[PDB]
Amino acid sequence: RIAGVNIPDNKHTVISLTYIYGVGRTTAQSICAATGVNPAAKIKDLSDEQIDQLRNEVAKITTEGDLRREINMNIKRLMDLGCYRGLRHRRGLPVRGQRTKTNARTRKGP
Amino acid sequence: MKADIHPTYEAIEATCSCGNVIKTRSTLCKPIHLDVCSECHPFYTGKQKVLDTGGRIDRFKQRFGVFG
Amino acid sequence: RLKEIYRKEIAPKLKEELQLANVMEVPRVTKITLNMGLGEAVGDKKIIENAVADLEKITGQKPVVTYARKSIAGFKIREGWPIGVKVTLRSDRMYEFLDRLLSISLPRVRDFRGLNAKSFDGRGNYSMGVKEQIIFPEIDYDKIDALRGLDITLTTTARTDDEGRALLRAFKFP
RNA sequence: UCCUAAAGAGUAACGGAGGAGUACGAAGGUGCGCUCAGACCGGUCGGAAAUCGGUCGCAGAGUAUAAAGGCAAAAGCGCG
RNA sequence: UGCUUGACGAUCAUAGAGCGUUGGAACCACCUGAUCCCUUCCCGAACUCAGAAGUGAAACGACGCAUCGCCGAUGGUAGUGUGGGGUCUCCCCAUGUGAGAGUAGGUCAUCGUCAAGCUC
RNA sequence: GCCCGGAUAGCUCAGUCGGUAGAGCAGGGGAUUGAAAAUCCCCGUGUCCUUGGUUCGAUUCCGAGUCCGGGCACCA
RNA sequence: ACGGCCAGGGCUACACACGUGCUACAAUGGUCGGUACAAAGGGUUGCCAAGCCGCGAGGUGGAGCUAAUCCCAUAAAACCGAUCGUAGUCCGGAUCGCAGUCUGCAACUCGACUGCGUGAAGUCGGAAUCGCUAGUAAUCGUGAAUCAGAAUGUCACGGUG
Ligand SMILES: [Mg+2]
Ligand SMILES: [Mg+2]
Ligand SMILES: [Mg+2]
Ligand SMILES: [Mg+2]
């Protein structure tokens, strides 16, 4: 609603845009360089005039509500095909090829 | 309508980023602009598009030519 | 005011659209009831007033707290007697609150579709659910607590739900 | 309180089944207003179910308390 | 010596439930905004108020249409008072009485007082 | 035959005045230790004997049905 | 055939417990922009510069070079200025999705890196238990052996201390 999702205040522009869930740290710097908003100033100090430009920039990369949909569809493409990469993904084993004998604990919990 | 029960319900102006001024009677008692309205939302503007489904065929031809 | 748009445009159009006989047979919106469900935090005695205050501002009308009529042991005990908060809005408030919908509360669902057209009653009453309480004028984000289950239940003078669809698509927000 | 008790009362058995040795300062009095249970459709984290809207209802709910007999002049529910 | 409609009743499914066409001449709600009374465990729909700018269908009003419900014969049977019997935990005879259920089929009820409209 | 008490983790015992199940042993994992025990730290466990009701809700309240104990089964 | 040759697969599986090692949990710190000093070693079947195109890993290019000559090769910590204000965060990087480069006939099982997005557990860690008495512990780099490619282990030497 503020930019697609609620944004924190009393913080710099680049850090504030990092919470948009689809723009990280480097792409946030590129958005600020293109628009002209100075990261040194807080989002509170900014005017309500260029935030439309910030929203336009957000509307050209992705929004979280569709990014999660499309990344889930990308996962589904592997999960419905028979590939080993999805075969381990459903069971919850490491996917990229990490060792499963020990310490594959992030994908299996305590 | 009971007198001393309801809040103050006055008239204010809702101005979107595109400039669509809407006269709305609310409890706001002040005008506040909005970032997006019914005329600017992508779904009602027709700009929502689709999730693009899947394009591996396309991708492979874009990636690898494979003459013959 | 949506009443002026309805009387001038929708009312004469729907008569010839739906092959109705005379002027007053056209469907019209009967009432709007919100019914913010305060089921969570039964034995609190602290969130009822917060929900009442939150719903008071977005409607311009004091709600009424709703008690229970039974006791689901799986749900909760009767000790937390107040469970619900309800509001009713007729034409003076209905057409003015309905302006928030379809004009500025369409950026309120954070959605792919405005509202599914397959959700209707057998007689033609429409219902919808609002996930978040952030979506309204004159509401803070820091001072507001994000625990507000709000519905928007619509009543229409329709014999069947196709008349309800035909009425809704005028002030369309699907 | 019901049956045994035989269509007025009454009627026994170490005969078959259940409860009481209280509660209410409003759970009483008056005026004014309102429907119950249950089924289905829809409605965001609830879901067979919580709170809401609509229809079908036509007392199958409820009675402060065990069962019997009654309760739309509601004997049930709310407000001054 | 008519039809329409309002009020209160006789009697409570042979009086009920369901299925069309309709009434502008008064009612019937609906409606403008709820200002003046009054009202909302929040609502001008409940309740109230200035009528009729509007409306005749949702709503109701009676007015069509016998599927369901209800009514229900005759006859027989069960039961039974009195008296006498048998093969006497049950039944029969003489006499008197006599159900319930089932079995052709009717019905969109039948009436009382007041008030108003249609013609004048 | 009649009457009183009890049924709780793998095993022994608390418990409720209905909304909730703990103590010890035992068990699992880790430390000790050359190794096993005893020391030490952490942890999972009952569907409260079965059934029918009372209730919004039963291990708890009520009536029955099994099993284990304790009293009596007397005057001839 | 318990001897041989060739394809794939396997030794990198996976509710679990153990040893070693690297990251962290931050403000004696995280980023941005300037600026200073090393040792040791490897390179004519090799090092592979400058210019050049790429967000980057890199691609072209071919010099000089058989070594105080040329390359690997910019050492980093520190110091100077700005911001962050201790917040599960300009901490933390695991995980996963998409897109590539290099090596190799061949990167699915099963490699190493680069670009974008995601952002977890983790707030200094029980009984216990280990290394260290001086350039010692602590912490930060550099280059090499094995090697087509592939290091948190390991080969070797240095900063502050
Ligand atoms: Mg009697
Ligand atoms: Mg008698
Ligand atoms: Mg009473
Ligand atoms: Mg190598």
Side-chain angles (χ1 to χ4, degrees), chain C residues 13-34:
Chain C
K13 187 263 189 303
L14 288 171
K15 184 175 72 175
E16 62 85 8
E17 191 67 9
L18 277 291
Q19 298 79 237
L20 298 171
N22 312 327
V23 175
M24 291 292 292
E25 289 79 331
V26 302
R28 58 183 179 181
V29 186
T30 335
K31 56 180 180 180
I32 293 165
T33 56
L34 281 69

PDB file of all heavy atoms in Angstrom, chain C residues 13-36, unseen atoms left out:
ATOM      1  N   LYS C  13     -31.449   1.262 -16.844  1.00  0.00           N
ATOM      2  CA  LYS C  13     -30.755   0.309 -17.703  1.00  0.00           C
ATOM      3  C   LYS C  13     -31.164  -1.121 -17.379  1.00  0.00           C
ATOM      4  O   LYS C  13     -31.449  -1.911 -18.289  1.00  0.00           O
ATOM      5  CB  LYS C  13     -29.243   0.487 -17.555  1.00  0.00           C
ATOM      6  CG  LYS C  13     -28.404  -0.330 -18.534  1.00  0.00           C
ATOM      7  CD  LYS C  13     -27.916  -1.642 -17.927  1.00  0.00           C
ATOM      8  CE  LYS C  13     -26.906  -2.328 -18.831  1.00  0.00           C
ATOM      9  NZ  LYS C  13     -27.451  -2.584 -20.193  1.00  0.00           N
ATOM     10  N   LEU C  14     -31.210  -1.471 -16.093  1.00  0.00           N
ATOM     11  CA  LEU C  14     -31.498  -2.846 -15.709  1.00  0.00           C
ATOM     12  C   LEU C  14     -32.900  -3.293 -16.100  1.00  0.00           C
ATOM     13  O   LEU C  14     -33.103  -4.490 -16.336  1.00  0.00           O
ATOM     14  CB  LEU C  14     -31.310  -3.030 -14.201  1.00  0.00           C
ATOM     15  CG  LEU C  14     -29.874  -3.022 -13.670  1.00  0.00           C
ATOM     16  CD1 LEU C  14     -29.884  -3.000 -12.154  1.00  0.00           C
ATOM     17  CD2 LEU C  14     -29.082  -4.218 -14.180  1.00  0.00           C
ATOM     18  N   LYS C  15     -33.861  -2.368 -16.183  1.00  0.00           N
ATOM     19  CA  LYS C  15     -35.222  -2.747 -16.546  1.00  0.00           C
ATOM     20  C   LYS C  15     -35.270  -3.360 -17.939  1.00  0.00           C
ATOM     21  O   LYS C  15     -35.836  -4.443 -18.127  1.00  0.00           O
ATOM     22  CB  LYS C  15     -36.145  -1.529 -16.469  1.00  0.00           C
ATOM     23  CG  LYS C  15     -37.617  -1.835 -16.740  1.00  0.00           C
ATOM     24  CD  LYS C  15     -38.500  -0.613 -16.534  1.00  0.00           C
ATOM     25  CE  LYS C  15     -38.310   0.420 -17.637  1.00  0.00           C
ATOM     26  NZ  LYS C  15     -39.252   1.564 -17.493  1.00  0.00           N
ATOM     27  N   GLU C  16     -34.683  -2.683 -18.927  1.00  0.00           N
ATOM     28  CA  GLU C  16     -34.638  -3.239 -20.273  1.00  0.00           C
ATOM     29  C   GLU C  16     -33.574  -4.322 -20.403  1.00  0.00           C
ATOM     30  O   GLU C  16     -33.671  -5.169 -21.299  1.00  0.00           O
ATOM     31  CB  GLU C  16     -34.409  -2.123 -21.302  1.00  0.00           C
ATOM     32  CG  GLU C  16     -33.086  -1.348 -21.182  1.00  0.00           C
ATOM     33  CD  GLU C  16     -31.908  -2.010 -21.890  1.00  0.00           C
ATOM     34  OE1 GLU C  16     -32.111  -3.001 -22.625  1.00  0.00           O
ATOM     35  OE2 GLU C  16     -30.769  -1.534 -21.706  1.00  0.00           O
ATOM     36  N   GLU C  17     -32.560  -4.321 -19.534  1.00  0.00           N
ATOM     37  CA  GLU C  17     -31.530  -5.350 -19.613  1.00  0.00           C
ATOM     38  C   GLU C  17     -32.085  -6.716 -19.224  1.00  0.00           C
ATOM     39  O   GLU C  17     -31.827  -7.716 -19.904  1.00  0.00           O
ATOM     40  CB  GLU C  17     -30.346  -4.973 -18.720  1.00  0.00           C
ATOM     41  CG  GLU C  17     -29.096  -5.832 -18.914  1.00  0.00           C
ATOM     42  CD  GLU C  17     -28.447  -5.639 -20.272  1.00  0.00           C
ATOM     43  OE1 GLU C  17     -28.856  -4.717 -21.009  1.00  0.00           O
ATOM     44  OE2 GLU C  17     -27.524  -6.413 -20.604  1.00  0.00           O
ATOM     45  N   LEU C  18     -32.856  -6.778 -18.134  1.00  0.00           N
ATOM     46  CA  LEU C  18     -33.342  -8.035 -17.575  1.00  0.00           C
ATOM     47  C   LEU C  18     -34.796  -8.326 -17.945  1.00  0.00           C
ATOM     48  O   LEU C  18     -35.411  -9.236 -17.378  1.00  0.00           O
ATOM     49  CB  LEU C  18     -33.161  -8.028 -16.055  1.00  0.00           C
ATOM     50  CG  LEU C  18     -31.775  -8.407 -15.514  1.00  0.00           C
ATOM     51  CD1 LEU C  18     -31.479  -9.890 -15.741  1.00  0.00           C
ATOM     52  CD2 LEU C  18     -30.668  -7.554 -16.117  1.00  0.00           C
ATOM     53  N   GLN C  19     -35.354  -7.586 -18.908  1.00  0.00           N
ATOM     54  CA  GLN C  19     -36.723  -7.806 -19.384  1.00  0.00           C
ATOM     55  C   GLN C  19     -37.737  -7.671 -18.248  1.00  0.00           C
ATOM     56  O   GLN C  19     -38.732  -8.396 -18.188  1.00  0.00           O
ATOM     57  CB  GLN C  19     -36.869  -9.169 -20.072  1.00  0.00           C
ATOM     58  CG  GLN C  19     -36.013  -9.361 -21.329  1.00  0.00           C
ATOM     59  CD  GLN C  19     -34.561  -9.688 -21.030  1.00  0.00           C
ATOM     60  OE1 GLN C  19     -33.655  -8.978 -21.466  1.00  0.00           O
ATOM     61  NE2 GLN C  19     -34.331 -10.771 -20.295  1.00  0.00           N
ATOM     62  N   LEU C  20     -37.482  -6.738 -17.334  1.00  0.00           N
ATOM     63  CA  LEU C  20     -38.390  -6.495 -16.223  1.00  0.00           C
ATOM     64  C   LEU C  20     -39.604  -5.704 -16.694  1.00  0.00           C
ATOM     65  O   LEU C  20     -39.550  -4.998 -17.705  1.00  0.00           O
ATOM     66  CB  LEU C  20     -37.671  -5.744 -15.103  1.00  0.00           C
ATOM     67  CG  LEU C  20     -36.489  -6.480 -14.468  1.00  0.00           C
ATOM     68  CD1 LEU C  20     -35.733  -5.551 -13.537  1.00  0.00           C
ATOM     69  CD2 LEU C  20     -36.950  -7.725 -13.722  1.00  0.00           C
ATOM     70  N   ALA C  21     -40.707  -5.831 -15.952  1.00  0.00           N
ATOM     71  CA  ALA C  21     -41.968  -5.236 -16.383  1.00  0.00           C
ATOM     72  C   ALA C  21     -41.990  -3.729 -16.156  1.00  0.00           C
ATOM     73  O   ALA C  21     -42.098  -2.956 -17.114  1.00  0.00           O
ATOM     74  CB  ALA C  21     -43.132  -5.902 -15.651  1.00  0.00           C
ATOM     75  N   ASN C  22     -41.883  -3.294 -14.895  1.00  0.00           N
ATOM     76  CA  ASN C  22     -42.013  -1.883 -14.539  1.00  0.00           C
ATOM     77  C   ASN C  22     -40.748  -1.359 -13.866  1.00  0.00           C
ATOM     78  O   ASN C  22     -39.734  -2.061 -13.797  1.00  0.00           O
ATOM     79  CB  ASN C  22     -43.227  -1.673 -13.629  1.00  0.00           C
ATOM     80  CG  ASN C  22     -44.476  -2.351 -14.156  1.00  0.00           C
ATOM     81  OD1 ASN C  22     -44.676  -2.452 -15.367  1.00  0.00           O
ATOM     82  ND2 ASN C  22     -45.323  -2.821 -13.249  1.00  0.00           N
ATOM     83  N   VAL C  23     -40.808  -0.123 -13.365  1.00  0.00           N
ATOM     84  CA  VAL C  23     -39.604   0.571 -12.915  1.00  0.00           C
ATOM     85  C   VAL C  23     -39.042  -0.074 -11.653  1.00  0.00           C
ATOM     86  O   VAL C  23     -37.834  -0.317 -11.549  1.00  0.00           O
ATOM     87  CB  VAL C  23     -39.904   2.066 -12.695  1.00  0.00           C
ATOM     88  CG1 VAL C  23     -38.686   2.779 -12.113  1.00  0.00           C
ATOM     89  CG2 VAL C  23     -40.337   2.720 -14.002  1.00  0.00           C
ATOM     90  N   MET C  24     -39.900  -0.358 -10.680  1.00  0.00           N
ATOM     91  CA  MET C  24     -39.450  -0.693  -9.335  1.00  0.00           C
ATOM     92  C   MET C  24     -39.106  -2.173  -9.150  1.00  0.00           C
ATOM     93  O   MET C  24     -38.740  -2.559  -8.036  1.00  0.00           O
ATOM     94  CB  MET C  24     -40.516  -0.276  -8.318  1.00  0.00           C
ATOM     95  CG  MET C  24     -40.692   1.234  -8.171  1.00  0.00           C
ATOM     96  SD  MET C  24     -39.276   2.065  -7.418  1.00  0.00           S
ATOM     97  CE  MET C  24     -39.347   1.429  -5.746  1.00  0.00           C
ATOM     98  N   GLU C  25     -39.199  -3.006 -10.185  1.00  0.00           N
ATOM     99  CA  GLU C  25     -38.826  -4.412 -10.065  1.00  0.00           C
ATOM    100  C   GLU C  25     -37.318  -4.633 -10.066  1.00  0.00           C
ATOM    101  O   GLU C  25     -36.872  -5.763  -9.840  1.00  0.00           O
ATOM    102  CB  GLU C  25     -39.446  -5.237 -11.197  1.00  0.00           C
ATOM    103  CG  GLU C  25     -40.946  -5.434 -11.106  1.00  0.00           C
ATOM    104  CD  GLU C  25     -41.716  -4.220 -11.576  1.00  0.00           C
ATOM    105  OE1 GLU C  25     -41.182  -3.097 -11.453  1.00  0.00           O
ATOM    106  OE2 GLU C  25     -42.844  -4.390 -12.080  1.00  0.00           O
ATOM    107  N   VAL C  26     -36.525  -3.597 -10.322  1.00  0.00           N
ATOM    108  CA  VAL C  26     -35.078  -3.746 -10.452  1.00  0.00           C
ATOM    109  C   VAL C  26     -34.499  -4.154  -9.099  1.00  0.00           C
ATOM    110  O   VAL C  26     -35.007  -3.702  -8.063  1.00  0.00           O
ATOM    111  CB  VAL C  26     -34.418  -2.455 -10.967  1.00  0.00           C
ATOM    112  CG1 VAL C  26     -35.002  -2.053 -12.319  1.00  0.00           C
ATOM    113  CG2 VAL C  26     -34.553  -1.319  -9.947  1.00  0.00           C
ATOM    114  N   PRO C  27     -33.464  -4.996  -9.038  1.00  0.00           N
ATOM    115  CA  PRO C  27     -32.838  -5.269  -7.741  1.00  0.00           C
ATOM    116  C   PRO C  27     -32.117  -4.043  -7.206  1.00  0.00           C
ATOM    117  O   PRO C  27     -31.697  -3.161  -7.958  1.00  0.00           O
ATOM    118  CB  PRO C  27     -31.851  -6.402  -8.044  1.00  0.00           C
ATOM    119  CG  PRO C  27     -32.282  -6.971  -9.336  1.00  0.00           C
ATOM    120  CD  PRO C  27     -32.882  -5.841 -10.097  1.00  0.00           C
ATOM    121  N   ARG C  28     -31.983  -3.996  -5.883  1.00  0.00           N
ATOM    122  CA  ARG C  28     -31.237  -2.933  -5.226  1.00  0.00           C
ATOM    123  C   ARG C  28     -30.539  -3.515  -4.007  1.00  0.00           C
ATOM    124  O   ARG C  28     -30.953  -4.543  -3.464  1.00  0.00           O
ATOM    125  CB  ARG C  28     -32.145  -1.762  -4.829  1.00  0.00           C
ATOM    126  CG  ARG C  28     -33.296  -2.139  -3.910  1.00  0.00           C
ATOM    127  CD  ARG C  28     -34.192  -0.940  -3.631  1.00  0.00           C
ATOM    128  NE  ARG C  28     -35.320  -1.283  -2.773  1.00  0.00           N
ATOM    129  CZ  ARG C  28     -36.270  -0.438  -2.390  1.00  0.00           C
ATOM    130  NH1 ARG C  28     -36.269   0.832  -2.769  1.00  0.00           N
ATOM    131  NH2 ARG C  28     -37.250  -0.877  -1.606  1.00  0.00           N
ATOM    132  N   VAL C  29     -29.475  -2.846  -3.579  1.00  0.00           N
ATOM    133  CA  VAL C  29     -28.693  -3.293  -2.433  1.00  0.00           C
ATOM    134  C   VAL C  29     -29.525  -3.036  -1.187  1.00  0.00           C
ATOM    135  O   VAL C  29     -29.955  -1.905  -0.937  1.00  0.00           O
ATOM    136  CB  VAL C  29     -27.337  -2.575  -2.361  1.00  0.00           C
ATOM    137  CG1 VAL C  29     -26.465  -3.164  -1.245  1.00  0.00           C
ATOM    138  CG2 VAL C  29     -26.625  -2.660  -3.701  1.00  0.00           C
ATOM    139  N   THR C  30     -29.764  -4.091  -0.409  1.00  0.00           N
ATOM    140  CA  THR C  30     -30.639  -3.975   0.758  1.00  0.00           C
ATOM    141  C   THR C  30     -29.886  -3.363   1.938  1.00  0.00           C
ATOM    142  O   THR C  30     -30.296  -2.336   2.487  1.00  0.00           O
ATOM    143  CB  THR C  30     -31.214  -5.347   1.122  1.00  0.00           C
ATOM    144  OG1 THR C  30     -31.227  -6.188  -0.043  1.00  0.00           O
ATOM    145  CG2 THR C  30     -32.628  -5.203   1.652  1.00  0.00           C
ATOM    146  N   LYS C  31     -28.778  -3.984   2.336  1.00  0.00           N
ATOM    147  CA  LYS C  31     -27.987  -3.505   3.461  1.00  0.00           C
ATOM    148  C   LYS C  31     -26.575  -4.060   3.342  1.00  0.00           C
ATOM    149  O   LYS C  31     -26.304  -4.959   2.541  1.00  0.00           O
ATOM    150  CB  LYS C  31     -28.627  -3.893   4.800  1.00  0.00           C
ATOM    151  CG  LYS C  31     -28.864  -5.386   4.975  1.00  0.00           C
ATOM    152  CD  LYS C  31     -29.503  -5.698   6.315  1.00  0.00           C
ATOM    153  CE  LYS C  31     -29.730  -7.189   6.463  1.00  0.00           C
ATOM    154  NZ  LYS C  31     -30.352  -7.529   7.768  1.00  0.00           N
ATOM    155  N   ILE C  32     -25.670  -3.501   4.143  1.00  0.00           N
ATOM    156  CA  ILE C  32     -24.288  -3.960   4.242  1.00  0.00           C
ATOM    157  C   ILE C  32     -23.997  -4.214   5.714  1.00  0.00           C
ATOM    158  O   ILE C  32     -24.107  -3.298   6.536  1.00  0.00           O
ATOM    159  CB  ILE C  32     -23.284  -2.944   3.666  1.00  0.00           C
ATOM    160  CG1 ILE C  32     -23.447  -2.813   2.146  1.00  0.00           C
ATOM    161  CG2 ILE C  32     -21.848  -3.355   4.027  1.00  0.00           C
ATOM    162  CD1 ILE C  32     -22.762  -1.597   1.538  1.00  0.00           C
ATOM    163  N   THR C  33     -23.625  -5.449   6.039  1.00  0.00           N
ATOM    164  CA  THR C  33     -23.207  -5.832   7.380  1.00  0.00           C
ATOM    165  C   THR C  33     -21.768  -6.328   7.340  1.00  0.00           C
ATOM    166  O   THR C  33     -21.394  -7.124   6.474  1.00  0.00           O
ATOM    167  CB  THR C  33     -24.125  -6.916   7.959  1.00  0.00           C
ATOM    168  OG1 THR C  33     -24.160  -8.042   7.074  1.00  0.00           O
ATOM    169  CG2 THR C  33     -25.535  -6.384   8.144  1.00  0.00           C
ATOM    170  N   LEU C  34     -20.959  -5.849   8.288  1.00  0.00           N
ATOM    171  CA  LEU C  34     -19.526  -6.118   8.304  1.00  0.00           C
ATOM    172  C   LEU C  34     -19.181  -7.323   9.172  1.00  0.00           C
ATOM    173  O   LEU C  34     -18.560  -8.272   8.685  1.00  0.00           O
ATOM    174  CB  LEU C  34     -18.756  -4.875   8.778  1.00  0.00           C
ATOM    175  CG  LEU C  34     -18.550  -3.776   7.729  1.00  0.00           C
ATOM    176  CD1 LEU C  34     -19.866  -3.095   7.371  1.00  0.00           C
ATOM    177  CD2 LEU C  34     -17.524  -2.751   8.200  1.00  0.00           C
ATOM    178  N   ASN C  35     -19.577  -7.315  10.445  1.00  0.00           N
ATOM    179  CA  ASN C  35     -19.420  -8.472  11.325  1.00  0.00           C
ATOM    180  C   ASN C  35     -17.950  -8.862  11.496  1.00  0.00           C
ATOM    181  O   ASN C  35     -17.515  -9.944  11.094  1.00  0.00           O
ATOM    182  CB  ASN C  35     -20.238  -9.655  10.797  1.00  0.00           C
ATOM    183  N   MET C  36     -17.185  -7.957  12.101  1.00  0.00           N
ATOM    184  CA  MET C  36     -15.790  -8.241  12.413  1.00  0.00           C
ATOM    185  C   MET C  36     -15.703  -9.370  13.430  1.00  0.00           C
ATOM    186  O   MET C  36     -16.116  -9.208  14.583  1.00  0.00           O
ATOM    187  CB  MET C  36     -15.087  -6.989  12.946  1.00  0.00           C
TER     188      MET C  36
END
